[PDB]
């Protein structure tokens, strides 16, 4: 009926604690809160479900 | 011989009734325990 809820943060995935590479990563921008829109959108429905 | 254990992240929620009727909130800190928080 349900799977588990994952919530992850892509910011911190693809480099922990590194300002430097966050600061890179800016200038690919909104694909990291794409991913948690939808990360959010699976986790959420398995309340519904 | 030393454990390293990365320290604490997790998600914040902010919890509110209606912004509409009101502009008090509450958070909830994910997968923290309070210990966590009034040392941070
Ligand atoms: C939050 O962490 C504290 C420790 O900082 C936990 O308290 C410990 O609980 C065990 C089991 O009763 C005791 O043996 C320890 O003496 C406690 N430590 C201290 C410093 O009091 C607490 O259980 C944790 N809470 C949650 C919800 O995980
Ligand atoms: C929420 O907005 C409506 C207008 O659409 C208003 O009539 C209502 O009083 C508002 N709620 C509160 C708690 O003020």
Known sequence: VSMTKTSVDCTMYICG???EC???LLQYGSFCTQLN???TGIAVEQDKN | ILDITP???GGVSVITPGTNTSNQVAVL???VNCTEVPVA
């Open chain 1, 17 to 19: 604690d590194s300002t």
């Open chain 1, 22 to 24: 966050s600061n890179l």
């Open chain 1, 37 to 39: 829109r939808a990360l």
């Open chain 2, 7 to 9: 320290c604490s992240f």
């Open chain 2, 29 to 31: 800190y994910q997968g």
